[PDB]
Design a binder for these strands. Sequence first.
DNA 1: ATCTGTT
Lengths: 35, 371, 244, 550
Amino acid sequence: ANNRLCVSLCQQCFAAKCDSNRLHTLFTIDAGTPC
Amino acid sequence: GTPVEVTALYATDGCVITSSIALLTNSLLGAEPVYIFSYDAYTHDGRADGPTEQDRFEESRALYQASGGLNGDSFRVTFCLLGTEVGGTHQARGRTRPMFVCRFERADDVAALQDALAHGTPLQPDHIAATLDAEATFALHANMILALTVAINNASPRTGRDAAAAQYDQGASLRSLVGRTSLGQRGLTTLYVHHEVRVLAAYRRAYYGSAQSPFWFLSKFGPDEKSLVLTTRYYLLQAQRLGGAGATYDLQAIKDICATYAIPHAPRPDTVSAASLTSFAAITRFCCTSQYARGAAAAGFPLYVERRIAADVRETSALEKFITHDRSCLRVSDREFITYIYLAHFECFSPPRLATHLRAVTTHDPNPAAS
Amino acid sequence: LDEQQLDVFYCHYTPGEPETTAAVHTQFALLKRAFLGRFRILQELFGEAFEVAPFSTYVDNVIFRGCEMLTGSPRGGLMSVALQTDNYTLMGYTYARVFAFADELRRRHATANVAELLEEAPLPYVVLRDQHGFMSVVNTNISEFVESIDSTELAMAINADYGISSKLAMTITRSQGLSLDKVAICFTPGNLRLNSAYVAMSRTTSSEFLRMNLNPLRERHERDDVISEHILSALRDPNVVIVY
Amino acid sequence: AEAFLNFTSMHGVQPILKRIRELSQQQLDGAQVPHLQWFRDVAALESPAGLPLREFPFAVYLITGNAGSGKSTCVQTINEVLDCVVTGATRIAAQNMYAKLSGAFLSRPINTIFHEFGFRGNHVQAQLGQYPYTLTSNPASLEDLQRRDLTYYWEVILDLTKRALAASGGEELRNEFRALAALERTLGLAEGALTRLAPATHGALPAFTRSNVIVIDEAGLLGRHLLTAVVYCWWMINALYHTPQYAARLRPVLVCVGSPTQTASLESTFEHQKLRCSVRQSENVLTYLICNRTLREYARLSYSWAIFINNKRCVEHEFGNLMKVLEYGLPITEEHMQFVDRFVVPENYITNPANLPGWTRLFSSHKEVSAYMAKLHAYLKVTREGEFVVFTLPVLTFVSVKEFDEYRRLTHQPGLTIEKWLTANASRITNYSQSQDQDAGHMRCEVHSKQQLVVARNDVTYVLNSQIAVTARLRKLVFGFSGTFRAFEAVLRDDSFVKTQGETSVEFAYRFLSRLIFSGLISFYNFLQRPGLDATQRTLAYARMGELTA
DNA sequence: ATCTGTT
Ligand SMILES: Cc1nc(N(C)C(=O)Cc2ccc(-c3ccccn3)cc2)sc1S(N)(=O)=O
């Protein structure tokens, strides 16, 4: 975002139903507290 | 000289249709004073040679001499209301419809009309009743009488009574009814006396939207004084008569164009205020005595309208042609094509460019030669 | 409370029943003048504290107990029709009887059995307040269901409810003719299409008030580009008008 | 300001007006206008297998654009300059269009398109599509498509034709226009002088006998079989009354406004025996006009197309780029994927009723909405913060016993349970589509003899002091209250409240306001009871009010 | 997975 920092958590799964070879995003939080 | 022609938009507090009908039928039991809201004056051409822009400006400025009292001796006035005429074809559709016509020739009538047009006092029904023009007034309500008569008599015309002397022809009934009906004052008076409700309902449909309160006018054509006068007069009266290139524009465009007609100002002692919009007296007095309703300020608005429209179109057309030619013969992928389209359209018509263009076409003088 | 404790203007002025249009207009004008004058006097007396004073006036006597409204009778008051684009507030419910609604139900509906059964067992009415603050009572919602099988038509059922809705949750298909301010989307994997995401993400003017539970661009989805091809091919035609 | 936000949208609408005016004045030949015998022939048929091949002329003009691009000013100018008829596909669209048009200069009431060509209540429960049809022509001509569209919509078409032909006094020709023409011919007057005044003297004639330019707004939600019906209806009406425009050989011109990307139409059907509802997607009018080849060649769509671009509200860069990419079908890159990662949050975050107060939740089913509503209602009770109470109200349904018996006999299957049938038909008995998102309790039914009826009763839960919307046309009665002192004075100062109501109860509105004002006095001393108010100003007010009353 | 026309 505007001059901020973004930290996200991602996962990659090897099952046949999920996908594999693909990256998935779980949630995003802000990390701008300690400017 | 020659009779000066005037078109007057008129209004009254109450029910305008009922009062007008009572005036027409001579049943002096519902007549009320009439207030003239806006008007325009012109003289018959009499010469085919089209005068230049600087000739009609002078000729028109010679009319509203110095006090809104037109120069002349005998006047011919047409009183009208809102509504759209039917059966006519043109570039656009009309916005007003004539109601009746009067002629002012005597000294007393001329003085009364000048007083009404200058200060704003209402006209009493006596003058209108006395000066009415019967032959021309009733040439308008001629087909409506026939239509109403046919509709009323449309009960099944069997025309087959036969008997001894009742065997009138199939087409003889309508022919006789038409022959025995007078398309003048008498027929209208009888129809009003016997079938008042139906007549009023029928008349309220040919003049759709003719009954509005002062706040409606104030909200639509206001709230400024200059706009309230000039835009009303141009949009309602002169646009269709002159019939130039600005007769196919709506009200918002006209107000936008008027916003650039910047001319000197002079404050009035006082203004109009709310709580008085319950009648047309205050608004009429405010409008009639304004400084934009006479002189050189009111003789040079239409010319500016035409000039500004032409100036805008001149550049718009060329830019559009350039863009279209470039668009039609470009061989690139979809992403590049979209990029080019939006980039070109932004580069042509960005906000600052429009602001500069608008600042380049502002006038500070009604005289075309000193613009 | 002085001698004019109850606004003795009441004890000395008795505005009897109205009359023809002229009398009605004169009375209305006089009452407006009097009300404006008294309000001006009080406002000059106190001012801002008076400007936000609570106010409530009703044609009759009304009381409120919990979520119920108790009133004598709804006599007077101009009828009107409620629009679907206006915003209301749920005030409560009432058990007062209105003759106009019952007579209209008797008139329009030829089914006397339903009318009699409803008369034996009544239903409450809903009391709402609009934006400006005028208390209103709304009518009930009755619907008729007649089936058509083969070529025969039979009337089968009648339904009676209230017919009001709340803008706090909905589907994605419904919201294709609406505008919102804050949105929180919830996709479901397995049947995701790109057009649904496009329709759902464009209900708000800005991107500061948008949330979702998964990323639809990183997942698997279905695409169908047939209209877009025609639209793109129509932009290279010198005969199509383009307005910026 | 407001002057340079209309500069480019007011100089680019003139060519549209020129083209539409040119289109709406062309004249047909004498051997192409449908005759009144065609509809008489149709009215005497039993199955759509005997329909011959015929053509109904028409013309179109398209206005497609993005949502939020500003296509309404075009309709505003068209209404102000030309003479047309404005309609809508639904009720909300009609109300919005009327608001805009009346707020600009002036307008008449606006209705839907279904009310225009004669849609009645019963037609709402017909079975659409039962007879097979197969195209026979190599790239089919216009007559083939028209016959197919007429075959699909058979029940409504046949009922409308029968009703229109019978209701016109049997074999008696309508005399609304013929008598005036006969009188004009006898009197030897100018053509059209007396007939054109017919609408003024008769106030019940349909609007399709007044103009031949029809504007349809939000045409993306309409099925493709409704492009023919409308046309059909037009001709029929004008062949019955013998209107002035029918004698000049003119044809309808349809102006369709919409957006072909963010809009679709659905079609549903009911299968008996198993009692199952099946819903699918179909084609709308805009896609039919743009994609078909025969229609594209017939209507000459290349010379009758205007496109509005630009969006007036977007103030962000990346959001606009993403919207353009999604709209125009461009390839997807990693930059967009990285941008869209800022909005993701866990699902349990969204589904909690204690997070993000006041936000709207969009689901993809009628069960998730109900579950979330029940959760919220349960939470609003124990964890109360005040000014929020929950109550309940009853709703009920009555059945017909004799009609149920008849239906069971006709469909067979003697063994049937009222509960199962009512559960299966939950989506069709109701009036509005939000009946399935309500928080309702356990079902219960009973049988009332004597009247020979069956009544089902249920309860529904509501909150207090919440914003709601009315999904229907219900009459309401106003009975008091006006707000605060300033708001009440402001409302009474202006007469817009009077003008909003119809021009028949002005005296009623004045009397109601007078009664409220009369009851509005008193209680001033209750306000004066404010603690620490005054000592002598009270007597000053007493004297002033007494003097004013005198 | 799924909506809306009728006072
Ligand atoms: C410097 C600049 N500002 C530019 N604006 C204001 C715009 O695009 C404005 C806009 C235009 C259309 C859309 C849109 C939205 C949905 C679907 C299709 N279209 C969004 C926003 S464009 C350029 S640039 N870099 O091309 O010259």
